[PDB]
Amino acid sequence: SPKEILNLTSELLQKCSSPAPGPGKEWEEYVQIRTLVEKIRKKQKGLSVTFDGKREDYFPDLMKWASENGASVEGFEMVNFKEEGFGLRATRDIKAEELFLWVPRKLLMTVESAKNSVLGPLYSQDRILQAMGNIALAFHLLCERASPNSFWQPYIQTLPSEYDTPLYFEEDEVRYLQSTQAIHDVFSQYKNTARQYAYFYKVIQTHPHANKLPLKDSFTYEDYRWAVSSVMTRQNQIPTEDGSRVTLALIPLWDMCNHTNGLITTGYNLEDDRCECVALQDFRAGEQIYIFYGTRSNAEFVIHSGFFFDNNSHDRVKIKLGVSKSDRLYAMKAEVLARAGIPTSSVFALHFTEPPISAQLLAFLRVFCMTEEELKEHLLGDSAIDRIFTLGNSEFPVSWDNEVKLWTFLEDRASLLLKTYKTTIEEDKSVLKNHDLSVRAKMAIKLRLGEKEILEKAVKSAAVNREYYRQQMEEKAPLPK
């Protein structure tokens, strides 16, 4: 039994350490790794540490523990909402901009507190823990979870026991994501998590510095999946106590807030050394208290936060572009891009906005479509630097011809990207309307639908811009300057 798991993890480690098999076999590799992980999971006993009470049975201890250490505990209560899970609900009227939530640093779990814990000796030895603060947080969480007298037990006992990150998806739920951009990040997350589990399983067994860890006695795959999912769905970047650099931290109590659209209203107060949150909007008594997590895409929300946000105003897809080495004007284009601070090839973003492209992508596309004569004007003479300076400004085109070319290219490229999907937008909408699906299945289908809808809007916006600049060209309008 004990030698069997070591065999499987060794088999899992070589499998997940192997290089990518090419993109055409990435699904087969994913299923192969899934098969090994489930075999290990069926031979283990789930979470090493489980608690007798329900999740809500421990929230009063969280409040008492946070109150003794200087945190705000009045004006809100914990409620199990259907849509978002557990969250905060106001018990009094809270006005927008009111400072209603604060958490002193003493309560936080940080990379620094991980270094000072029982994990300290192993942390001082393992290059992965030293380089990856998020993984160190995950093991800090696991070691304190298995320590009954831990200072952070009131926080750990109120954490979720499961998440909706793709690590928890069924095979057929991930299968909805075939042919999308997002599935490659799902592949990487699964392979990384499996490789990390097998690596640290062997490290804990071979390193004498790990002999005092509770994980030396029990460390299951379920433990690791839970720990990394807890960190990825809740971790935060804060300044060190010195204020000279940044670190990663879990912030109890405040991280129970669920997400809505708006602005970030949570910041660190270094003078008083505590996290502070002001109300994003008015919250009447009985209304859920929301915060704005950040300007993340729905792909990021699904993969790293475990939920899909309808009406995400910051949604985007990726588009990879680069100047071809077979372009006769490669050297000139690469130099103009270098002088503008833009790489010759990169992954850009297409936004669900008008225009769908940033200033950096606009600048790239302009250089991408420049003639030799236009390139020389951005490389030579007393006006070249001024021309570089306006490259990302929609109000100052290189020429009407350059604009028509770049919007034609983007229209063609976004149209071609749409042709690489296994389903159409209308088919996805029919699936959502006519099938009865799990939460995780709809996250996947809405993800693949959102990718095509962003590309479809980008096609329409580029076609409209092509016609605008074509009109300027045929009317011989003076260039703005």
Partner: peptide
């Protein structure tokens, strides 16, 4: 504005 804005669930690299 916010000197140290805190992003709930900020995305990190896992390898």
């Amino acid at each position: 504005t916010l000197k140290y804005p805190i992003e709930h669930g900020i995305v990190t690299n896992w390898d």
